[PDB]
Amino acid sequence: LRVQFKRMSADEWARSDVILLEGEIGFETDTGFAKFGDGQNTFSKLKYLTGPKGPKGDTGLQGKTGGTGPRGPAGKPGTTDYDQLQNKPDLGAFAQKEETNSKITKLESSKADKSAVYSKAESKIELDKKLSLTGGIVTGQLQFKPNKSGIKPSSSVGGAINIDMSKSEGAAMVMYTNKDTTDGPLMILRSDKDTFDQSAQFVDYSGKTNAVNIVMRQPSAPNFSSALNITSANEGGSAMQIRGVEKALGTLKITHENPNVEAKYDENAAALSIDIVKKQKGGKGTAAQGIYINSTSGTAGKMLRIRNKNEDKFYVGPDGGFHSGANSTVAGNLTVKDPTSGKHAATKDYVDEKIAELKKL
Amino acid sequence: PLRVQFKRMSADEWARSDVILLEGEIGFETDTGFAKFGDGQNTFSKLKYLTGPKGPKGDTGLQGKTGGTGPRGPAGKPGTTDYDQLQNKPDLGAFAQKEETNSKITKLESSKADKSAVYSKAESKIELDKKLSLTGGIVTGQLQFKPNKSGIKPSSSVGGAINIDMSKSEGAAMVMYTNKDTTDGPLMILRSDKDTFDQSAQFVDYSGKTNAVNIVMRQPSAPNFSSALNITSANEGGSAMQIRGVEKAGTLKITHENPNVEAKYDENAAALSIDIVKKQKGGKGTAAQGIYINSTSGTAGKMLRIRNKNEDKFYVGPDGGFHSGANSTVAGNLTVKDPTSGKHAATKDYVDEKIAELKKL
Amino acid sequence: PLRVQFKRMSADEWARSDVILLEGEIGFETDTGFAKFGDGQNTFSKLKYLTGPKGPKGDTGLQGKTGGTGPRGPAGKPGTTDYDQLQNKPDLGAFAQKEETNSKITKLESSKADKSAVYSKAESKIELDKKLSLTGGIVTGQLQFKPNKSGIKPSSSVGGAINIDMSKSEGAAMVMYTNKDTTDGPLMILRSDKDTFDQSAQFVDYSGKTNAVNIVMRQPSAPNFSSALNITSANEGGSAMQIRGVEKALGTLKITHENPNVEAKYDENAAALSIDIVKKQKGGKGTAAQGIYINSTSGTAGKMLRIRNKNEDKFYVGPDGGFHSGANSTVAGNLTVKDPTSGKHAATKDYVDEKIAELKK
Ligand SMILES: CC(=O)N[C@@H]1[C@@H](O[C@@H]2O[C@H](C(=O)O)[C@@H](O[C@@H]3O[C@H](CO)[C@@H](O)[C@H](O[C@@H]4O[C@H](C(=O)O)[C@@H](O[C@@H]5O[C@H](CO)[C@@H](O)[C@H](O[C@@H]6O[C@H](C(=O)O)[C@@H](O[C@@H]7O[C@H](CO)[C@@H](O)[C@H](O[C@@H]8OC(C(=O)O)=C[C@H](O)[C@H]8O)[C@H]7NC(C)=O)[C@H](O)[C@H]6O)[C@H]5NC(C)=O)[C@H](O)[C@H]4O)[C@H]3NC(C)=O)[C@H](O)[C@H]2O)[C@H](O)[C@@H](CO)O[C@H]1O
Ligand SMILES: CC(=O)N[C@@H]1[C@@H](O[C@@H]2O[C@H](C(=O)O)[C@@H](O[C@@H]3O[C@H](CO)[C@@H](O)[C@H](O[C@@H]4O[C@H](C(=O)O)[C@@H](O[C@@H]5O[C@H](CO)[C@@H](O)[C@H](O[C@@H]6O[C@H](C(=O)O)[C@@H](O[C@@H]7O[C@H](CO)[C@@H](O)[C@H](O[C@@H]8OC(C(=O)O)=C[C@H](O)[C@H]8O)[C@H]7NC(C)=O)[C@H](O)[C@H]6O)[C@H]5NC(C)=O)[C@H](O)[C@H]4O)[C@H]3NC(C)=O)[C@H](O)[C@H]2O)[C@H](O)[C@@H](CO)O[C@H]1O
Ligand SMILES: CC(=O)N[C@@H]1[C@@H](O[C@@H]2O[C@H](C(=O)O)[C@@H](O[C@@H]3O[C@H](CO)[C@@H](O)[C@H](O[C@@H]4O[C@H](C(=O)O)[C@@H](O[C@@H]5O[C@H](CO)[C@@H](O)[C@H](O[C@@H]6O[C@H](C(=O)O)[C@@H](O[C@@H]7O[C@H](CO)[C@@H](O)[C@H](O[C@@H]8OC(C(=O)O)=C[C@H](O)[C@H]8O)[C@H]7NC(C)=O)[C@H](O)[C@H]6O)[C@H]5NC(C)=O)[C@H](O)[C@H]4O)[C@H]3NC(C)=O)[C@H](O)[C@H]2O)[C@H](O)[C@@H](CO)O[C@H]1O
């Protein structure tokens, strides 16, 4: 039972009014399409007989893997360290800065600049301008001006200057001059306040010869110059005092040596010369005396004894009675006592009485 | 022309219908127009539709995201590891060696004079000016002399612990001044303590044309008993003073000037005063003499020559015979010789040689 | 009421079957359940199926796996070879410069005072103490004075090669002491060698209240010929010594003789003043010098000589020249007198030849 269906060309159906029954199939001889029938509608307006639709296609494949990445950044640059090097130089053998500048700083502060020290020869040259205790030579004026320095007056250790020769031969001091002339003496002592209760020079001699000795030497031409000259203006005291304790010798010994051999050269020369004068100005005169002999305690010796070649020629005794030597003279009359023995001077009351007592008887 | 109709339902009515299509019989969906065939042993639900083919495969996927950037390579190795090959190597020559330098400094610390061990110029100076100079100075203390085996010569020209030589300089050798109202000692003092001392205390060897030594006491405000020179001796075997002279035409010249204008002020004054005394500490008496004139060689001049206004008034001659001037007196008797001249005193042996020679015849 | 089934084979058997479907006849596959229409002139194998339309395209695929991480970057650049850019560079600042130091050291050795060329503190002192100080000292050698153009003044107030001023200090100016048993010279010595020296050797300008110059010889163990003062002159034209005074009372020169012993007759040969006139020591034939010479160029009214003993007058010469004895005298000769005009006056011979021949009657 091979059944064929109602069929036309695909176009012939569209132009046809033939109505297929509800359930009757209609065919398109072109391409093979087909539809059913709606028993009251033309072929154009009725459903075809297709299937639903196929299922969903498979999901696509998986994409190609991504490209490999880019090269990372370059490494950081190298570093060079001192300590890890080889042949490092030894720094120890180098002088530290601070320690050195400190050593030098202490040196400039602790050491003696040349300009602040005397050299050996500089020290010497300035020393030789100074007196030494082993000797020296002073050319200038050496003044002494003590002041509350406790200078004691002892005649053994004191004095502003003290020379002690008890352990050394020689002299203490010499003052020598070879000058023809000058304008002043050598040594000078002076006190100006008349209340000064002390001496100018003091000599406490113990020894075996002349204590103080003054000598004038024989001059070329003689002239009036004395070896010692004393002068006083104190009217209440003698100009000079001499005391002695001689046993057999004179306390003051004056001697006159003849300058010439011929005996009569020194006929006007004396051993002791006295001259009494008046005031050298307003003076009216003088009643002064020449020689004053006395023995306030009383003597038995002769108050004056003139001699010549050790032979007596004139003397006065303690009684006051003199004894001449040769022929004398009196320019006057001599008052005597009555002659009581064959030699006694004859008065006049003797010559008369014995002239008249021969009253022839 | 047997028009065949087929089995047909609505799309829903098929699912709930029990109609079993025969093996090959067609079934219709009056809705969708879909259709299936038959299994003659199955409901419509279980008969497979007439689906279409499967759709095509989906597009291939995209492409993966690019990979991450790579990692940083390792850091570079250091340059050189030997010191010698480095660049800009420092010049070590410009650095001071340690030992060589500390030795240089040490030689200085040993060769130079610390300040604390040397007097400065000003430190030395202050001690220099405290010492005596040869150009002058001012001594405030006591300058003692104590020579000992120092070769002090005794020469009167160069010796002495002090020697002053003014042969090339005007002025005085030494001056000793005091303006004090009072003190407890003199100025200059000479003293010898060993009574065996065989030398002088002071020696003056003067050669010149004026007074060698000159002593003057000046006029005091109020007079008193003070002498310009005072001599004292306790050596019983020698004179207290010695004077020798060679005067051609007086050896010792004594002069008394009247202190006042009035002629009789000095009425009790003498030029030379003598006194003979006993021992002051138990003396019984004295047999000493006053004045002793002599001429061991023999003189022709007068042993005593008194004058007044240069007019002779009394003199003793070398013969021993005096010669008065005016009227005298004898409180006693004068023994004389028999008168062998027209003048001459009368004895008694010549008054009575004539008083008897006139017998009566 | 007939039900039509269609022509059907297995799905494979159709492809290998020669059956030709009629135009519109449907053919069935007993397998898959598919079916096709007819071509009226085609085998089943070459006939379009009766399916629905094509399914839709599948979903796009997923995204590929992300790419791998990149490769490690290149190595870093190498380290540096310059000293300045090194790491852990040593600090050179702490090192002393060579030249700056060698310059510092050189300047020091030239600017500072080597030890061997300067006296130490102790050497300067040891050499200082050998020099005299102005506050005191002990001179052991000879201190010479040799002034020359030194402006040495001669003033008796400030001048002199040495000048001592004690106006501000108690005590003595100068002391010369000796304790030696014997020596070869005196202490102080003054000497002028040119006999033209027109000035004095020593000068004492004293103002005060006691003895100006004071000389003392002390009692020796054994007495001997030693004088406290000794004058000697060789000038035939000038006195050896000069004394001037202005005394109101007392003698200008006071001589006193004290007996050394208690026995009254111990000093029987001793005098106060001793005079001796002698010749020249080298050939004198004699001398005509005088002993004592009193005169008063101004004229005196007092007595030229007044001898006393126990303060009672015993002999005196007056200004007239008339003496006055005390007791009995003697004349080894004849005494020329005047004719007696009074009863006591001595009688001559022409007075005893007179009153005799007046008895020639
Ligand atoms: C013509 C006529 O007839 N006219 C009549 C008139 O007669 C005349 O009258 C004159 C008149 O007016 O006076 C008269 O002149 C005096 O004659 C006498 C004769 O006896 C003279 O002696 C006197 O001269 C001197 O004058 C002075 C003076 O004026 O001041 C007296 O004073 C003395 O001055 C000196 C100067 O400064 C002093 O130094 C001195 O002091 C003493 O020093 C001693 C000393 O050496 O240090 C002391 O003693 C101890 O000494 C021993 C010595 O060995 C030492 O060892 C001690 O030291 C110790 O010892 C030692 C040691 O040895 O190793 C170690 C220890 O460590 C040490 O400490 C000494 N002591 C100490 C301190 O330690 C002593 O204490 C001091 O005092 C001072 N005094 C003395 C005593 O010397 C002198 O004394 C005196 O001699 C004449 N004066 C004057 C003014 O002229 C004539 O002689 C007459 O003919 C009639 O008088 C009048 C009426 O009466 O009428 C007229 O008409
Ligand atoms: C009243 C009465 O009639 N009473 C009677 C009594 O009479 C009295 O009795 C007295 C008595 O007791 O004797 C009598 O005599 C005098 O008495 C007193 C004292 O006693 C004096 O008036 C006198 O004595 C004088 O003084 C002293 C003294 O006595 O103390 C004598 O001694 C002298 O002392 C000084 C000090 O020490 C000595 O220095 C001196 O020696 C000399 O020194 C010189 C010196 O400068 O040091 C020396 O000259 C240098 O020599 C050398 C050597 O070569 C040369 O080289 C130098 O030259 C220089 O050389 C060089 C060189 O070498 O590089 C470089 C230069 O270019 C160059 O210049 C010389 N220097 C020069 C030239 O510048 C010299 O050699 C030394 O000798 C010492 N003298 C001596 C001799 O040792 C004095 O000599 C003496 O004058 C007594 N005499 C006299 C005439 O007055 C009284 O006259 C009477 O009143 C009766 O006696 C008794 C009897 O019973 O009875 C009574 O009644
Ligand atoms: C046997 C017989 O009968 N004989 C006869 C025989 O005799 C002759 O006659 C005499 C006799 O018969 O006895 C005797 O001869 C003389 O007798 C006198 C007796 O007095 C003797 O003095 C004399 O010796 C002479 O003495 C004088 C003297 O008087 O001093 C000496 O002269 C002086 O010499 C020294 C050495 O050169 C000098 O130092 C001195 O110069 C003066 O010194 C003054 C002073 O005082 O210091 C100074 O004045 C100062 O000046 C200044 C400036 O104005 C002031 O600043 C100072 O003032 C002070 O200033 C201050 C201050 O500045 O802040 C503070 C104060 O407030 C203030 O005051 C002044 N003054 C002071 C205090 O500083 C200055 O330096 C000078 O002016 C000098 N001048 C003086 C003082 O005059 C002589 O050197 C000395 O010779 C006897 N002569 C001799 C040679 O020995 C003899 O026996 C015989 O000559 C007959 O010849 C014969 C004939 O036939 O017959 C016989 O019978």
Ligand SMILES: CC(=O)N[C@@H]1[C@@H](O[C@@H]2O[C@H](C(=O)O)[C@@H](O[C@@H]3O[C@H](CO)[C@@H](O)[C@H](O[C@@H]4OC(C(=O)O)=C[C@H](O)[C@H]4O)[C@H]3NC(C)=O)[C@H](O)[C@H]2O)[C@H](O)[C@@H](CO)O[C@H]1O
């Ligand atoms: C008339 C008469 O005087 N008699 C005759 C005598 O004349 C005097 O003799 C004495 C004499 O030689 O005995 C002498 O005296 C000295 O004469 C001078 C001048 O008159 C006189 O200056 C003397 O004193 C001196 O004075 C001075 C001075 O500078 O002033 C220094 C002397 O140191 C000092 O002595 C005086 N007296 C002395 C002490 O000598 C002199 O001859 C006459 O005055 C005469 O010489 C003889 C003849 O042979 O005959 C007598 O009749």
Ligand SMILES: CC(=O)N[C@@H]1[C@@H](O[C@@H]2O[C@H](C(=O)O)[C@@H](O[C@@H]3O[C@H](CO)[C@@H](O)[C@H](O[C@@H]4OC(C(=O)O)=C[C@H](O)[C@H]4O)[C@H]3NC(C)=O)[C@H](O)[C@H]2O)[C@H](O)[C@@H](CO)O[C@H]1O
């Ligand atoms: C014109 C005349 O001569 N007058 C008669 C007078 O003669 C004088 O007598 C006095 C006297 O005895 O006092 C004598 O005095 C001596 O000389 C002077 C001054 O008097 C003086 O040296 C002495 O007097 C005393 O000396 C002393 C001492 O201790 O020695 C201390 C006193 O300072 C002082 O008062 C004295 N003698 C001595 C030792 O120096 C004087 O020389 C006589 O000329 C006479 O005494 C009377 C009668 O009795 O008559 C007058 O007309």
